[PDB]
C-alpha cells in the first residue's frame, strides 16, 4: 500500500522583521530564533544576540527587510551564512530548503531569491510558500482567514484550498512597532529617561517614582544612534510584553483607572506603577480614530480589517472564513487581545454566520505558526514531487518558481 | 389576531425584495470531479497537523 | 412573481443542492450532527483496554508518524464518573 | 447494542490512494450553506 | 430440542384484560367459566392478603383440570412458589402422613432474603505499620495504625486500618502479592490466594494462583437468594457443624426424614417476621397443588381441616374426578368426589365440562403444532371423529406414531391412511374392554 | 475481544480536529517496556533488527528524475515511491487552433483569454474562486463573477465533448449561470442587511411560528 509522511532531510526558514526562525523539517518548534536586525561596520556583519549586544565603535544597526520583503541582499546573505555555519552546522548542498515569503511578495524578489539559493548556496532543491498558507496548515486548516499582527503590519489574509486570495488582502501599519512608538511617547510624556542596559555599570534600588541611582560605564566606545535606538527598543519591547493589556470592552478612562496597577522596573532601577495608560495605548489597534497625532480617521481597526477582508471575498467562501479565524503574530500576545477581537467580531459578523476563532494563544504557536506549517508541509510524502530541483532551475531558469510555487 | 394579514403582507414584501432567507435559491450542482493530487496533500496535511499537536 | 427575480426557475437536466434553513452548517470536525457533518474519524467515543486500566473516557484511534497507532483523549466533566462508573 | 448490530471503532489513517475513479471530491466550504446530496424529484418546479 | 410433555402446550389462561376468557389463547381452548374462575384465583394469590383459602377443580377425566392448575402456575411466573404433589405421596415409610402435608404446606411459602455487604479486595502491596512511638506512657514502640494497600484492576488505594487487625492478619498468613478479602462491619480478613501475575507457566499448587480480581477496590454487594420455609426448618433442625463427632456420625447412619416439631416452626416464623420488619426479607406466599386428592385418607382430610384454617397457610388447589365414591380410611362412608362434606364446605368448587367435537379438533391441531407435526384436513377430521368416539387423550396420542409411519413411507405429512393404520395397530380402553369379552 | 462503548444509556459524543479542549489529556502511545525490561528481556533478546539505510529514491511522479533521500529498510531499495499513486490530474480539455474556430469566441472572448482560462484551470484544478483571484483582469478586462468563466469553460467542454464522441448527450455540464448569479446576489443582499432588518425577519418568523402552532 502506502505509508504516512516522509522525512527527506529538509530545512525550513521563516525570516521576519523581528527574528529569524530556522530549523529542520519534522520538528514541532524552530531550532533557533535570533534577531533579524544585525550590526554592520564599514563590510563586516555581526549577527545574533551575543555578538550584536556588545557595544562597538561606528557599528550601524540595520534590517535586510522592508515591508516584509528583502531589500539588502548582502545582509540577507550574511544572515543565511551565519545560520548555515553556526546554527544548522551542515553543508548547504545536501539539504532541501523550504522558505516562507510574504503574501504580497513581488515576482522579481522571488526570482532573485531562487537565483541566490540555487547558484550561490548550491542547494539540491527549493520551495517557496506564503506565510498565511503555512499558518493555516499548522492548525490543520486549508481554508480560513489569517490575521497576522507582527512588528511592521497587521494583515488579514484569506486562504482557500491552500492558496492565498491576493485580492482579499487588507494591510494596516498598526502593529508592534506602532505600540513601541506609543510607549516612547508615553515615557517622554512621563519624563522617564530610558537608559538601556549597556550603559549601566551598576545600580541601586530606589522608591517608586524617585530618581534612579546608577553609575555609567566609563570604558564605553562611542556608538551610533541607530544601535542605541535599537537597544532602547529592546527595553520597550519587554515593557510591552509585561505591562500592556487590552481592554475587554471599549475603553472608558474611569473604569480603567479603577483597575489594579502593574509595577515595572527599568534597567537603571527606575520603577513606577502603571494605571490606565497601559490600556489606553493598545486601544489604538482597535479604535485608531482617538489616537493623538495620528494621520486622519481613514485607518482601520483590527476587527474592521478582518470584516473588510472577508467582505472583499466571494460570498460562497465567507462562511468558511468566519468559521476559521486564525490569529497569529507576536503582537497578538498582548493580554486580552484575542477576547476583545472575538467579542468585536461577534458584534459585527452576521448572525447567519457562525464565528470561530482557533485556540492558538501561546508564544510558540502565535509566533512560529508559519515555521510549523513549513515543517508539516515538508514532512508530507505527497509534497515531495512539488520541490523545485536544481535540474529544473538549470533547464528553465529562475522563472520556474512562478509556475511551481503559486 | 388582526395583524396576521399584516405579518403575511410584510413577509411578501421581503420575498419580493429577496430578503426572506427561508426562500433561498439552491446551489446548482457542477460536474463531479475525482480528487486530485492537491486534495490528497491537504488530507495528509490535516493528519500530520494533528500528529504534531 | 411571489419571490421576485429570485424565483427558482428550474432548467432541464440540472441537479441542485438544497440550502440549510433550520440550522447553520458547520465543518466535518469540531461539529457533531448537532451543527454539522459528523465524520466518524474525528469522533471520540468511550473506550476500554484489555490491560486492566479501566475506561479511559472518550477517545479516537489515530495513526501517527512511523506507523504507530495512538489513542487520542478528550476532556469531559463526567470523567470522574466514567472512572469508577 | 440492543440485539446485535455491532459497530467497529474507526481508525484515522493516511489518505490511502485511490483505485479506478469515482466522484470523490467534495467542497467542504459549500457544505456550510448547502446540503451534501442533491435534491431528489421532490423539486417543486417542473422546469 | 426440549422434550415434549402432555401439558407443554399450555402457556397461560388466555384471558382478556377484563378477565373474560378468549375462546382459544395461550394453548387452551374452551372451559371459559373455569378459566375465568382461575383468573380470579390468580388475582387472589397475587393479592397476598389471604391464607389457607382452598379451591377444588372437579369434573370428568380429560377435561383439562390438571392443565388449568398448570396454567395458574404460568400466569404467576417463577417468582411465586408452586408445589405440585399427588395424594398418594403422603404414604411415607419415614414420617407420618400429616407431616408430609405440613412439609408441602411450608414448601409453598417463599422468602427472598436481600442481605447486603460492603468489602475491600485486591492485591496487597504494603503490609506497612504506622508509628507514634508511645501510648502516652512508658513505651517501646507503638504503631497506632496499619497501612494496607490494595490494587485489583481499576486502581490502587491505601487503607489505614485499625491496629487490632494485625492478629487476624498473620492468622491468615498473608504476604505481599497475596489477594485477600475484608468485610467492613467486622473487619475480618480472609485470604483468597495470590495473583495470577506470579503464575502463567508456573502452576503446581493446590491453593490455585487465583486470578487478580476485576472491578473497583471497594465493592458493595447485594445478594438475593430465594428460599422456602421448609428449607429453613430442615436446615435449622440438624446439627450441621462438622466440629462435633455426632455430625460426622450422621454421615454413616442414615439421615432419614424426621417429624419436625411446632416449636421450630414457631421460632422460624418469629425470626422471619423479625427479618421482614428489619427489611432484610420479603415474603412470597405461593400455591400447593394436590392432584388425585381422593387418594388421601380420612385422617389427612381431617388434618387439612385444621391446616387450611391457619393464618400461615398457602393457597391450596385440589383436583378430583371421582363421583359419589367411598372415602378412603372409612368402611362404608360415601361422599361426593371421594372427599368428606366437611372439607368440601371449606373449598370453592370450579367445574370443568366435557368438550365438543370442534374443541377436540382444535386441541388436536394445537398438539400437532406443538409436536412439530403436519396433518392434513381430512386426517384431522378423522382423528376428531376418533376422539369423539373414544377419548380426546387417546386421539392425541395417535399423532406421533402416525407421523413416524409417514416418515417411514417417505411422506412429510399425516394423511388419513396413516391414522387409519395406527388406529388398528393400537387400541383404546373401551375397544380393548369389548374385546376382553371375546378373549375372556 | 476488545471493547469500545457508544451507549444509549448516557448518549453523548464529542468531535474535534486537533483536540477538543486545552484540558484534554495527552494521547496514549504504544510501548513494549511498560512492565519493565526484565519482563521482556528474552522476547527482545531472541530477535535482531532488520537494517535500515539512508538511501536515494526516484519517481514521486516527477518529470526531472531528481533523486531525494529518505530512511527505508535496506531490502526495499528499488521499490517505486508509494506516493506517486496520488498524482491524479484533472481532465481539462485541450484543443487546437482549428478546433477553436467552432469554439467561436462569441465576439466577447478571445483565443488568448480562453487559453489563459484553461491554463489557470489546469494549474488550480478548477477551483474557480482561486482562478478568479489569479485571473489577469488588467490584461483581459474585469471578467469577474466566476459564473462568466464557469459557463465559458463548461460550454467549451460541452462543444468539445459533442465533437469528439460519435454520439451522446450530456445533462449536468449544462451550466445555468443566471441561476447562480441570482443565488449569489440574494446571498449578498442578505449579507449586507443591517441588524434591524435581521431582527425584523426574526420577529416575523417567530410570529409565523407562534400563530401556526
Specify the DSSP class assigned to residue A24: E
Closest residue in F to B1 (Cα–Cα) = F211
C-alpha dist (Å) from residue F183 to A266, A301, F71, F176: 60, 32, 52, 11
Give chain B positions within 8 Å (CB) of C63.
47
Domain co-membership, E195 together with E241? no
| Burial (0-12, 13-18, 19+ Cβ within 10 Å), E95 | middle
C-alpha dist (Å) from residue B14 to A209, B1, F210: 64, 21, 19
Q: Count of domains in chain E?
A: 3
Domain co-membership, E397 together with E328? no
Give chain A positions within 8 Å (CB) of F17.
140
Domain co-membership, E100 together with E164? no
Among F25, F27, F171, the residue with its CB nearest the CB of C75 is F25
Domain co-membership, E102 together with E112? no
C-alpha dist (Å) from residue E128 to A174, E124, E166: 66, 10, 11
- Residue A197: CB atoms within 10 A of its CB come to 13
Question: Looking up cell 417468582, which residue turns up?
Answer: E79
Give chain D positions within 8 Å (CB) of F188.
none
Question: Looking up cell 490584461, which residue turns up?
Answer: F139
Closest CA relative to residue A178, chosen from A272, A291, A304: A291
Could B42 and A140 be called an inter-chain contact, meaning their C-beta atoms sit closer than 8 Å? Answer: no
Closest residue in D to B28 (Cα–Cα) = D38
Residues 2-41 of F with CB under 8 A from C: 2-7, 13-17, 19-21, 23-30
Domain co-membership, E180 together with E324? no
- Structural domain containing residue E80: 1-107+236-354
Task: Note whether A104 contacts F: Cβ–Cβ < 8 A.
Answer: no
Widest Cα–Cα separation across chain C:
70
Note whether A385 and F60 are within 8 A (CB): yes
Which one of A7, A354, A356, A379 makes the best mutation probe of the C interface by having the most chain C beta carbons within 10 Å? A354
Among B15, B26, B28, the residue with its CB nearest the CB of C3 is B15
Closest CA relative to residue F134, chosen from F151, F153, F117, F110: F117
Which one of A127, A135, A140, A371 makes the best mutation probe of the B interface by having the most chain B beta carbons within 10 Å? A140
Return phi, psi of residue A398, to 5°: -75, -5
> Strand order in A32-35's β-sheet?
A32-35, A19-24, A11-15, A97-101, A125-130, A388-389
Note whether E146 and E161 are within 8 A (CB): yes
| CATH number assigned to the domain comprising residue E282 | 3.40.50.300
Specify the DSSP class assigned to residue A83: I
Question: Looking up cell 470531479, which residue turns up?
Answer: B33
| CATH number assigned to the domain comprising residue E226 | 2.40.50.360
Annotated binding site of E for ATP: 59-66
Q: Which is it for the CA torsion A207, A211, A213, A219, positive or negative?
A: positive
User: F195-212 and B4-17 are packed helices; what angle lies between their axes, rounded to 10 degrees?
Assistant: 130
Domain co-membership, E338 together with E250? yes
> Strand order in E54-58's β-sheet?
E82-86, E287-291, E315-320, E54-58, E347-351
Domain boundary among E220, E235, E250: E235
Question: Looking up cell 523550504, which residue turns up?
Answer: A98
Resolution in A: 2.4
Closest CA relative to residue F173, chosen from F141, F196, F194, F150: F150
User: How far is the first Cα of chain C from the last one, in angstroms, to the nearest whole number?
Assistant: 62
Question: Looking up cell 534600588, which residue turns up?
Answer: A205
- What is the Cα–Cα distance from A306 to A341, expressed in whole angstroms? 10
Which one of F88, F91, F128, F195 makes the best mutation probe of the B interface by having the most chain B beta carbons within 10 Å? F88
CB within 8 A of E275, min separation 6: which ones? Answer: E113, E281
Domain boundary among E235, E269, E284: E235
Q: Would you list the DSSP string of A194-243?
A: ---GGGEEEEE---TTSPPEEEE-SSPPP--HHHHHHHHHHHHHHHHHHH
Closest CA relative to residue E215, chosen from E294, E293, E154, E288: E154
Note whether E393 and E399 are within 8 A (CB): no
Question: Looking up cell 384436513, which residue turns up?
Answer: E377
Give chain B positions within 8 Å (CB) of F150.
30
Q: Would you list the DSSP string of A300-325?
A: --HHHHHHHHHHTS-TTTHHHHHT-E
Note whether B48 and A379 are within 8 A (CB): yes
- H-type helices in E77-196, by residue range? 97-107, 165-171
- Residue C65: CB atoms within 10 A of its CB come to 18
Question: Looking up cell 366435557, which residue turns up?
Answer: E354
Closest CA relative to residue E324, chosen from E333, E315, E316: E333
Question: Looking up cell 389457607, which residue turns up?
Answer: E52
Domain co-membership, E60 together with E82? yes
Q: Which is it for the CA torsion F134, F135, F137, F138, positive or negative?
A: positive
Give the distance from CA A120 to its chain's centroid: 27
Note whether E315 and E288 are within 8 A (CB): yes
Note whether A90 and A99 are within 8 A (CB): no
Domain co-membership, E250 together with E180? no
- What is the Cα–Cα distance from A28 to A47, expressed in whole angstroms? 25
Half-sphere exposure of A81 (CA within 13 A, CB side): 13
Strands E334-336 vs E324-326: parallel, antiparallel or unpaired: antiparallel
Closest CA relative to residue A96, chosen from A129, A125, A127: A125
Q: Would you list the DSSP string of C16-75?
A: EEEE--SS----SSS--TTTS---GGGEEEEEE-SSS--EEEEEEEEE-GGG-EEEEE--
What's the grid cell of residue A326?
Answer: 486564525
Note whether A117 and A81 are within 8 A (CB): no
- What is the Cα–Cα distance from E286 to E108, expressed in whole angstroms? 5
Q: Three-state SS for E31?
A: coil
Tell me, yes or no, whether chains A and E touch by having 3 or more C-beta pairs under 8 A: no
Domain co-membership, E372 together with E327? no
Give chain F positions within 8 Å (CB) of A1.
82
Domain co-membership, E118 together with E231? yes
User: F147-164 and F177-191 are packed helices; what angle lies between their axes, rounded to 10 degrees?
Assistant: 160
Question: Looking up cell 510624556, which residue turns up?
Answer: A189
- Chain A neighbours, 3+ Cβ pairs < 8 A: B, C, D, F
CB within 8 A of E251, min separation 6: which ones? Answer: none
| Burial (0-12, 13-18, 19+ Cβ within 10 Å), A228 | middle
What's the grid cell of residue A402?
Answer: 512562478
CA distance E213 to chain C (A): 10
- What is the Cα–Cα distance from C69 to C56, expressed in whole angstroms? 16
Q: Three-state SS for A368?
A: coil
Note whether E356 and E92 are within 8 A (CB): no
| Burial (0-12, 13-18, 19+ Cβ within 10 Å), F99 | middle
CA distance B28 to chain F (A): 7
Domain boundary among E204, E235, E266: E235
Which phi-psi region, left, alpha or beta, contains residue E136 (left: φ > 0; alpha: ψ -120 to 50)? left
Q: Three-state SS for F48?
A: coil
- What is the Cα–Cα distance from B53 to F18, expressed in whole angstroms? 7
Which phi-psi region, left, alpha or beta, contains residue E187 (left: φ > 0; alpha: ψ -120 to 50)? left
| CATH number assigned to the domain comprising residue E398 | 1.10.8.60
Task: Find the angle CA(A114)-CA(A118)-CA(A123) to the nearest 5 degrees.
Answer: 120
Task: Find the angle CA(A127)-CA(A132)-CA(A135) to the nearest 5 degrees.
Answer: 90
Strands C69-73 vs E28-29: parallel, antiparallel or unpaired: unpaired
CA distance C65 to chain A (A): 6
Specify the DSSP class assigned to residue E17: T
Closest CA relative to residue A321, chosen from A289, A356, A367: A356
Among C5, C17, C65, the residue with its CB nearest the CB of B29 is C17
Return phi, psi of residue F46, to 5°: -90, 20
Give the distance from CA F204 to its chain's centroid: 39
Among F17, F88, F182, the residue with its CB nearest the CB of B36 is F88
What's the count of helices (H) and strands (E) in chain E, helices before strands? 15, 19
Task: Tell me how long chain C is.
Answer: 85
Domain co-membership, E112 together with E230? yes
Task: Give the containing element (helix H, strand E) for F97.
Answer: helix F97-100
Domain co-membership, E70 together with E118? no
CB within 8 A of A108, min separation 6: which ones? Answer: none
Q: Would you list the DSSP string of A85-133?
A: IIII-S-GGGS-EEEEE-TT--HHHHHHHHHIIIIIS--SEEEEEEHHH
- List of long-range contacts for A81-85, beta carbons under 8 Å, 24+ apart: A82/A45, A82/A47, A82/A48, A83/A13, A83/A20, A83/A22, A83/A32, A84/A121
Annotated binding site of E: 59-66
Amino acid at each position: 500500500g502506502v505509508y504516512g509522511g516522509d522525512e527527506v532531510g529538509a530545512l525550513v526558514f521563516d525570516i521576519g522583521s523581528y527574528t529569524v526562525r530556522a530549523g529542520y523539517a519534522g520538528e514541532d518548534c524552530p531550532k533557533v530564533d535570533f534577531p533579524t536586525a544585525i550590526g554592520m561596520v564599514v563590510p563586516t556583519y555581526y549577527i545574533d544576540t551575543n555578538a550584536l549586544r556588545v557595544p562597538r565603535e561606528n557599528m550601524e544597526a540595520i534590517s535586510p527587510l522592508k515591508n516584509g520583503m528583502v531589500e539588502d541582499w548582502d545582509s540577507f546573505q550574511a544572515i543565511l551564512d551565519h545560520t548555515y555555519k553556526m546554527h544548522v552546522k551542515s553543508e548547504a548542498s545536501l539539504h532541501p530548503v523550504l522558505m516562507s515569503e510574504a503574501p504580497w511578495n513581488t515576482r522579481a524578489k522571488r526570482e532573485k531569491l531562487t537565483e541566490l539559493m540555487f547558484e550561490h548556496y548550491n542547494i539540491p532543491a527549493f520551495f517557496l510558500c506564503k506565510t498565511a498558507v503555512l499558518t493555516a496548515f499548522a492548525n490543520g486548516r486549508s481554508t480560513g482567514l489569517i490575521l497576522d499582527s507582527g512588528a511592521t503590519h497587521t494583515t488579514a489574509i484569506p486562504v482557500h484550498d491552500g492558496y492565498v486570495l491576493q485580492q482579499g488582502i487588507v494591510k494596516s501599519p498598526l502593529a508592534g512597532d506602532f505600540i513601541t512608538m506609543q510607549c516612547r511617547e508615553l515615557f517622554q510624556e512621563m519624563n522617564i529617561e530610558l537608559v538601556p542596559p549597556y550603559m549601566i555599570a551598576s545600580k541601586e534600588a530606589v522608591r517608586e517614582g524617585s530618581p534612579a541611582n546608577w553609575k555609567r560605564k566609563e570604558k564605553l566606545p562611542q556608538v551610533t544612534r541607530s544601535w542605541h535606538n535599537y537597544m532602547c527598543n529592546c527595553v520597550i519591547q519587554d515593557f510591552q510584553a509585561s505591562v500592556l493589556q487590552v481592554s475587554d470592552s471599549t475603553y472608558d478612562e474611569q473604569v480603567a483607572a479603577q483597575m489594579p496597577t502593574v509595577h515595572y522596573e527599568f534597567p537603571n532601577g527606575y520603577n513606577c506603577d502603571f494605571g490606565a495608560e497601559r490600556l489606553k495605548i493598545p486601544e489604538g489597534l482597535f479604535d485608531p480614530s482617538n489616537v493623538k497625532g495620528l494621520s486622519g480617521n481613514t485607518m482601520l481597526g483590527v476587527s474592521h480589517v478582518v470584516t473588510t477582508s472577508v467582505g472583499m471575498c466571494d460570498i460562497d467562501i465567507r462562511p468558511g472564513l468566519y468559521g476559521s479565524v486564525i490569529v497569529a503574530g507576536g503582537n497578538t500576545l498582548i493580554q486580552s487581545f484575542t477576547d476583545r477581537l472575538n467579542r468585536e467580531l461577534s458584534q459585527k459578523t452576521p448572525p447567519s454566520m457562525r464565528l470561530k476563532l482557533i485556540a492558538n494563544n501561546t508564544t510558540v504557536e502565535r509566533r512560529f505558526s508559519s515555521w510549523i506549517g513549513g515543517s508539516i508541509l515538508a514532512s508530507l510524502g505527497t509534497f515531495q514531487q512539488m520541490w523545485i530541483s536544481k535540474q529544473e532551475y538549470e533547464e528553465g531558469g529562475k522563472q520556474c518558481v512562478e509556475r511551481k510555487c503559486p | 389576531i388582526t395583524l396576521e394579514n399584516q405579518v403575511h403582507q410584510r413577509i411578501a414584501e421581503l420575498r419580493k425584495a429577496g430578503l426572506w432567507s427561508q426562500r433561498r435559491l439552491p446551489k446548482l450542482q457542477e460536474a463531479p470531479r475525482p480528487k486530485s493530487h492537491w486534495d490528497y496533500l491537504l488530507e495528509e496535511m490535516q493528519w500530520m497537523a494533528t500528529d504534531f499537536a | 412573481d411571489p419571490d421576485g427575480p429570485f424565483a427558482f426557475r428550474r432548467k432541464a437536466g440540472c441537479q441542485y443542492y438544497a440550502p440549510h434553513l433550520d440550522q447553520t452548517g458547520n465543518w466535518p470536525w469540531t461539529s457533531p450532527k448537532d451543527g454539522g457533518l459528523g465524520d466518524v474519524r474525528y469522533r471520540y467515543c468511550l473506550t476500554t483496554l484489555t490491560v486492566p486500566q479501566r475506561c479511559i473516557g472518550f477517545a479516537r484511534r489515530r495513526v501517527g508518524r512511523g506507523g504507530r497507532v495512538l489513542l487520542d483523549r478528550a476532556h469531559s466533566d463526567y470523567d470522574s464518573v466514567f472512572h469508577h462508573l | 447494542d440492543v440485539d446485535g448490530q455491532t459497530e467497529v471503532m474507526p481508525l484515522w489513517t493516511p489518505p490511502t490512494p485511490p483505485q479506478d475513479d469515482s466522484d470523490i471530491y467534495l467542497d467542504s466550504v459549500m457544505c456550510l450553506m448547502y446540503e451534501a446530496t442533491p435534491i431528489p424529484e421532490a423539486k417543486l418546479p417542473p422546469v | 430440542t426440549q422434550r415434549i410433555a402432555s401439558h407443554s402446550h399450555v402457556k397461560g389462561l388466555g384471558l382478556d384484560e377484563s378477565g373474560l376468557a378468549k375462546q382459544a389463547a395461550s394453548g387452551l381452548v374452551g372451559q371459559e367459566n373455569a378459566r375465568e374462575a382461575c383468573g380470579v384465583i390468580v388475582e387472589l394469590i397475587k393479592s397476598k392478603k389471604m391464607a389457607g383459602r382452598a379451591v377444588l377443580l372437579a369434573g370428568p377425566p380429560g377435561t383439562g383440570k390438571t392443565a388449568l392448575a398448570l396454567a395458574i402456575a404460568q400466569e404467576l411466573g417463577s417468582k411465586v412458589p408452586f408445589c405440585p404433589m399427588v395424594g398418594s405421596e403422603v404414604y411415607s415409610t419415614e414420617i407420618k402422613k400429616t407431616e408430609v402435608l405440613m412439609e408441602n404446606f411450608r414448601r409453598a411459602i417463599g422468602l427472598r432474603i436481600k442481605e447486603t455487604k460492603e468489602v475491600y479486595e485486591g492485591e496487597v502491596t504494603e503490609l506497612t505499620p504506622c508509628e507514634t512511638e508511645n501510648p502516652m506512657g512508658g513505651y517501646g514502640k507503638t504503631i497506632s495504625h496499619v497501612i494496607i494497600g490494595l490494587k485489583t484492576a481499576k486502581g490502587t488505594k491505601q487503607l489505614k486500618l485499625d491496629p487490632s487487625i494485625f492478629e487476624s492478619l498473620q492468622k491468615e498468613r498473608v504476604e505481599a502479592g497475596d489477594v485477600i478479602y475484608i468485610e467492613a462491619n467486622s473487619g475480618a480478613v480472609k485470604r483468597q490466594g495470590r495473583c495470577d501475575t506470579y503464575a502463567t507457566e508456573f502452576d503446581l499448587e493446590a491453593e490455585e494462583y487465583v486470578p487478580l480480581p476485576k472491578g473497583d477496590v471497594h465493592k458493595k454487594k447485594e445478594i438475593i437468594q430465594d428460599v422456602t420455609l421448609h428449607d429453613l426448618d430442615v436446615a435449622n433442625a440438624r446439627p450441621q457443624g462438622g466440629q462435633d463427632i455426632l455430625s460426622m456420625m450422621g454421615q454413616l447412619m442414615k439421615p432419614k426424614k424426621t417429624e419436625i416439631t411446632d416449636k421450630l416452626r414457631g421460632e422460624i416464623n418469629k425470626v422471619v417476621n423479625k427479618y421482614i420488619d428489619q427489611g432484610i426479607a420479603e415474603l412470597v406466599p405461593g400455591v400447593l397443588f394436590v392432584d388425585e386428592v381422593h387418594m388421601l385418607d380420612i385422617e389427612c382430610f381431617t388434618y387439612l381441616h385444621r391446616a387450611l384454617e391457619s393464618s400461615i397457610a398457602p393457597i391450596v388447589i385440589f383436583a378430583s374426578n371421582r363421583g359419589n365414591c367411598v372415602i378412603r380410611g372409612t368402611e362404608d362412608i360415601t361422599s361426593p368426589h371421594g372427599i368428606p362434606l366437611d372439607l368440601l364446605d371449606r373449598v370453592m368448587i370450579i367445574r370443568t365440562m366435557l368438550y365438543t367435537p370442534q374443541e377436540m379438533k382444535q386441541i388436536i391441531k394445537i398438539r400437532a403444532q406443538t409436536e412439530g407435526i403436519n396433518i392434513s384436513e381430512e386426517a384431522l377430521n378423522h382423528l376428531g371423529e376418533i376422539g369423539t368416539k373414544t377419548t380426546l387423550r387417546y386421539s392425541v396420542q395417535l399423532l406421533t406414531p402416525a407421523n413416524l409411519l409417514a416418515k417411514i413411507n417417505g411422506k412429510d405429512s399425516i394423511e388419513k391412511e396413516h391414522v387409519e393404520e395406527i388406529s388398528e395397530l393400537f387400541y383404546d380402553a373401551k375397544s380393548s374392554a369389548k374385546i376382553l369379552a371375546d378373549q375372556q | 475481544t476488545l471493547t469500545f462503548k457508544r451507549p444509549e444509556g448516557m448518549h453523548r459524543e464529542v468531535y474535534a480536529l486537533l483536540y477538543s479542549d486545552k484540558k484534554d489529556a495527552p494521547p496514549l502511545l504504544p510501548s513494549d517496556t511498560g512492565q519493565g525490561y526484565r519482563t521482556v528481556k528474552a522476547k527482545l533478546g531472541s530477535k535482531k533488527v532488520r537494517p535500515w539505510k539512508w538511501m536515494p529514491f526516484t519517481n514521486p511522479a516527477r518529470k526531472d528524475g531528481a533523486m531525494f533521500f529518505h530512511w527505508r529498510r535496506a531490502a526495499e531499495e528499488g521499490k517505486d515511491y508509494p506516493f506517486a499513486r496520488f498524482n491524479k490530474t484533472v481532465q481539462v480539455p485541450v484543443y487546437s487552433e482549428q478546433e477553436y474556430q467552432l469554439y467561436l469566441h462569441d465576439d466577447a472572448w478571445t483565443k488568448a483569454e480562453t487559453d489563459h482560462l484553461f491554463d489557470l484551470s489546469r494549474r488550480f484544478d478548477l477551483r474557480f474562486v482561486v482562478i478568479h483571484d489569479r485571473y489577469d483582469h488588467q490584461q483581459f478586462k474585469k471578467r469577474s463573477v466566476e459564473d462568466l468563466k464557469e459557463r465559458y469553460y463548461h460550454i467549451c467542454a460541452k462543444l468539445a465533448n459533442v465533437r469528439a464522441v460519435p454520439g451522446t448527450d450530456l445533462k449536468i455540464p449544462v451550466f445555468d449561470a443566471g441561476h447562480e448569479r441570482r443565488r449569489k446576489e440574494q446571498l449578498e443582499r442578505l449579507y449586507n442587511r443591517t441588524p434591524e432588518q435581521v431582527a425584523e425577519e426574526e420577529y416575523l418568523l417567530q410570529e409565523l411560528r407562534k400563530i401556526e402552532a
